[PDB]
Design a protein around this ligand. Structure first.
Ligand SMILES: CC1=[NH+][C@H]2[C@@H](O1)O[C@H](CO)[C@@H](O)[C@@H]2O
Ligand SMILES: [Ca+2]
Length: 572
């Protein structure tokens, strides 16, 4: 199992021992970051190097001729880790580290390279920006999954957006950015520093000079890739001719002047199909090397063949995709922990880049991020479900089943202004649907369904309790804890409500009162946890499980009230 899966893989059904004695050719000429991964993992010859190095001369026809490509070979006689370029060598090592299992390797031959040129993450959501420690952890994770791109653009950073985009970062923060940049470098990730000036930009010399001075300060802190964001603004900063002129100016006086600038990227104001001469003005005027970002047919959407042709026709270049999932900044009471799916797997050539805007919950986003990394590297082989399982097992190996259970009932967004939904709880959804119907109509429910609902609530309780106490990824557990409490409460409510379904008039009373107490505890968590100004609270298992419970409760309470002439409160 390899994530992302390589372009080409031939496996020989033999295994070799990681050599106790070995001879390393190329250690001094190969990418230092790749050599470092190799030595920590470690007579038999091992050859490491970039094409052009004396170490790998014998394999140069083996090395794929692609940016970031690599040839990797393991057999009983030798090991070869040969990049087409320095980052390709590092990528060989990240594949190599996954082959190693118990001091053993399979005999293989891999030729690999990314299908999409830029792959990664844009921290571009509304809400609490990622902590410094969060970001350090992200960048290690990106290099492991061959994501080469991190776009730094937290809407609420005042040195990124209006009005202090004009001011150098204060010393403390600048030292932090500088560390991020060094750590990105170590993990072969391009730190792309974004600026968001359009809300108060003046199309004059004063503001244009300030923007270049700011980019120059960022250059001094090590930054080598840059973006200019014009998303979600109003006023004169939306002018497409002015924007293109600015980006072209930046390109002419900065990106073409410095020896080593990599990505120059812009996010347009009209960044999705439903929100549109703006696009053709940019496509025609903006220098061809400059990237243009795009979220799809709507603010939140998945990328289709027709959707991507539509945009590429207007911008006159392959669109650099900003995918708004798992971003939850418009449904902040939900965690979106489901599979990444819905994106067309045959359009790699029609995109310059593919990044995912994640949740404010950094560790919880690694499930989707790991999947996006898999998809963007090798879309033709992208496997939604398997990759979601591999993500979870990679992130929490000590409690993989429990995180799966929690994530599979924490996927949908609930009703929202963007109209964007995800599947959730599909496993039990038939059994749920059948159970509910047998009440609506007044018939006997199938027993197997009752038990499947029991088993589901039980596994939910187990997973909640185990996740709470897990110490392998504490930051993850801190992020999800309030939803964990609420998820456990849901499961307990579920067990008690089913017990109410199985008839004693005094037993039913105990169980009803118990359920009233559980509802109250859930109200309390919803009223005191995650109290943001927009979608306060904590909602979990909303698509299928919570309605199933609430409906079943309202039904059985009604039957009871009709039977014993009582007036129990049937609300939820
Ligand atoms: C390009 C773009 N910018 C906005 C918009 O898409 O919607 C996102 C999700 O609500 C939000 O996070 C982002 O800041
Ligand atoms: Ca070299």
């Amino acid at each position: 199992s390899l994530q992302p899966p390589p372009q080409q893989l031939i496996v020989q059904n033999k295994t070799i021992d990681l050599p106790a004695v070995y001879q390393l050719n190329g250690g001094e000429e190969a990418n230092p970051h790749a050599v470092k991964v190799l030595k920590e993992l470690l007579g038999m010859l091992i050859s490491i190097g970039e094409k052009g190095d004396k170490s790998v001369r014998k394999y140069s026809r083996q090395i794929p001729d692609h940016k970031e490509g690599y040839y990797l070979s393991v057999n009983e006689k030798e090991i070869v880790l040969a990049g087409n370029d320095e980052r390709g060598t590092y990528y060989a090592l990240q594949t190599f580290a996954q082959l190693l299992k118990d001091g053993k390797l399979p005999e293989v031959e891999i030729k690999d390279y990314p299908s999409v040129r830029y792959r990664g993450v844009v921290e571009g959501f509304y809400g609490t920006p990622w902590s410094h420690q969060a970001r350090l952890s992200q960048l290690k994770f990106y290099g492991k999954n061959k994501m080469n791109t991190y776009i730094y653009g937290p809407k609420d950073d005042p040195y990124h957006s209006a009005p202090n985009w004009r001011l150098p970062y204060p010393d403390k923060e600048a030292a932090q950015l500088q560390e991020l940049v060094a750590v990105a470098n170590e993990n072969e990730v391009d730190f792309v520093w974004a600026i968001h000036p359009g809300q108060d930009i003046k199309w004059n010399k004063e503001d244009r000079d300030l923007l270049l001075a700011k980019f120059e300060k960022m250059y001094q802190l090590g930054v080598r890739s840059f973006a200019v964001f014009f998303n979600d603004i109003s006023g004169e900063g939306t002018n497409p001719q002015k924007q293109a002129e600015l980006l072209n100016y930046i390109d002419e006086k900065f990106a073409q002047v410095k020896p080593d600038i990599n990505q120059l990227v812009m996010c347009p104001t009209e960044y999705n199909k439903s929100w549109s001469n703006y696009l053709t003005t940019l496509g025609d005027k903006l220098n061809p090397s400059i990237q243009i970002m795009w979220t799809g047919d709507r603010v939140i959407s998945d990328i289709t063949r027709d959707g991507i042709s539509w945009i590429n026709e207007r911008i006159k270049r392959p669109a650099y995709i900003w995918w708004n999932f798992p971003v939850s900044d418009y449904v902040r009471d939900h965690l979106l922990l489901g599979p990444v799916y819905g994106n067309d797997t045959t359009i790699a050539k029609e995109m310059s880049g593919f990044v995912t805007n994640p949740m404010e919950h950094a560790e919880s986003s690694k499930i989707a991020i790991y999947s996006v990394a898999s998809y963007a590297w090798n879309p033709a082989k992208y496997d939604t479900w398997q990759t979601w399982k591999d993500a979870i097992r990679t992130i929490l190996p000590s409690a993989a089943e429990e995180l799966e259970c929690f994530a599979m009932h924490n996927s949908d967004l609930g009703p929202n202004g963007h109209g964007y939904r995800r599947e959730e709880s599909m496993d039990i959804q038939p059994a749920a649907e059948r159970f509910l119907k047998a009440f609506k109509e007044g018939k006997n429910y199938d027993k197997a369904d009752f038990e499947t609902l029991q088993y589901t609530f039980e596994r939910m309780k187990e997973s909640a309790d185990i996740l709470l106490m897990n110490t392998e990824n504490k930051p993850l557990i801190v992020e999800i804890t309030p939803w964990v409490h609420q998820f456990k409460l849901t499961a307990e409510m579920g067990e008690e409500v089913l017990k109410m379904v199985e008839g004693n008039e005094s037993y039913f009373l105990r169980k009803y009162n118990h359920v009233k107490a559980l509802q109250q505890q859930m109200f309390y968590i919803d009223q005191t946890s995650n109290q943001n100004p927009y979608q306060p609270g904590v909602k979990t298992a909303t698509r299928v499980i919570k309605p199933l419970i609430d409906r079943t409760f309202a039904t059985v309470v009604k039957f009871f009230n009709q039977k014993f002439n009582a007036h129990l409160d049937a609300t939820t």
